[PDB]
Design a protein around this ligand. Structure first.
Ligand SMILES: CN1CCc2c(c3ccccc3n2Cc2ccc(C(=O)NO)cc2)C1
Ligand SMILES: [K+]
Ligand SMILES: [K+]
Ligand SMILES: [K+]
Ligand code: NA
Ligand SMILES: [Zn+2]
Length: 354
């Protein structure tokens, strides 16, 4: 009946030397950590130490070439960091980036280990840079290595290959890297909710549409819930959880739940354009706690309004600690259309949807 928390100020060292106001700020993690202190949540958690991921652990999901290229940035001059970062879609690199990415992943491995060895019931990881856009062979969208995907494979490496891991990705963006890593895998159920706008929203691929249901033995094990038609908020997220996320998750019966917990769908986020409230995130967390005997690890992804992310992630930790959920309209038409499209796509695979 204990909640773990991992945070290490060393992850602040990754920075954008050309644009100090770039939204993926060092202060994202320190602001969230400070809010946990202010709300007296930190003293209620068991502190789990950060560690570096090893290169062998990175190789659970990533190619040796990709690992070595990112590692090579540790001693690069500015011009070379710029050139390397520009090889990718939406990446900046500093000499500290590789270490920080290692720390984000190893923090999550230690948290998964703490849950699976029974030291804690659940945990929260206040980490950066984020992970879910990183692919086997490339960095993308602020992400170097796919922390959540690696954590699922790490968990399987200390239990069994077929350990059932649910990844719920509520960052406003599609976790293209996570989808691809697990596309043929029935051991890892990936469920993403994301703004899509028929491909107009980053990362601008039809891979994020509802008809991408998985491949081969993984068919049915990839659930994309794509939003179209502008601002969505608590009503739409609650409805998606009620009709899709929770029924599928219960049927899958995960043994571990990882949350790719971006807070860029939050009210106030300049990039997401959505209105999910801190109370909304608390309710989503509380629902997920009903799965996997409560074995839930919340991993920070995106989220760029410092006040919004600090309040939102803190509310999630309050839920993990067992606090009562806070008090919480009809859906937008396009949201009903999205949910129905996903229901039709997934009813062949999940009896709970029929
Ligand atoms: C072109 N628009 C979409 C893409 C984009 C925009 C943007 C603005 C500032 C910095 C990065 C930006 N990016 C790249 C970008 C990449 C990843 C993420 C992300 O990881 N969000 O959680 C957020 C933004 C605006
Ligand atoms: K998502
Ligand atoms: K999958
Ligand atoms: K289909
Ligand atoms: Na260890
Ligand atoms: Zn995002």
């Amino acid at each position: 009946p204990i909640t773990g928390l991992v945070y290490d100020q060393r992850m602040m060292l990754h920075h954008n030397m050309w644009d100090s106001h770039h939204p993926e700020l060092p202060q994202r993690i320190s602001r969230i950590f400070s809010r946990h202190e202010e709300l007296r949540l930190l003293s209620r958690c068991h502190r789990i130490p950060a560690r570096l991921a090893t290169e062998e652990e990175l190789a659970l999901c990533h190619s040796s070439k990709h690992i070595s290229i990112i590692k090579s940035s540790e001693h690069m001059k500015p011009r070379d960091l710029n050139r390397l970062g520009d090889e990718y879609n939406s990446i900046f690199i500093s000499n500290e980036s590789y270490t920080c990415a290692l720390l984000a992943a190893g923090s999550c491995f230690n948290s998964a280990q703490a849950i699976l060895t029974g030291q804690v019931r659940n945990a929260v990881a206040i980490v950066r840079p984020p992970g879910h856009h990183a692919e086997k062979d490339t960095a993308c969208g602020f992400c170097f290595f796919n922390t959540a995907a690696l954590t699922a494979r790490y968990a399987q490496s200390i239990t069994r290959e077929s350990l059932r891991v649910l990844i719920v990705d509520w960052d406003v963006h599609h976790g293209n890297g996570t989808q691809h890593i697990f596309e043929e895998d029935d051991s890892v159920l990936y469920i993403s909710l994301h703004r899509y706008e028929d491909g107009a929203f980053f990362p601008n691929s039809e891979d994020a549409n509802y008809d991408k249901v998985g491949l081969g033995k993984g068919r049915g094990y990839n659930v994309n819930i794509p939003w179209n038609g502008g601002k969505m908020g608590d009503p739409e997220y609650m409805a998606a959880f009620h009709h899709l996320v929770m029924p599928i998750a219960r049927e899958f019966a995960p043994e571990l739940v990882l949350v790719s917990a971006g807070f860029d769908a939050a009210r106030g986020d300049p990039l997401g354009g959505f209105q999910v409230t801190p109370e909304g995130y608390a309710h989503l967390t509380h629902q997920l706690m009903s799965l996997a005997a409560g074995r839930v690890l919340i991993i920070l992804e995106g989220g760029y309004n410092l006040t919004s992310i600090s309040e939102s992630m803190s509310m999630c930790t309050s839920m993990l600690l067992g606090d009562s959920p806070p008090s919480l309209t009809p859906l937008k038409t396009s949201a009903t259309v999205s949910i129905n499209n996903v229901l039709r796509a997934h009813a062949p695979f999940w009896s709970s949807l029929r």
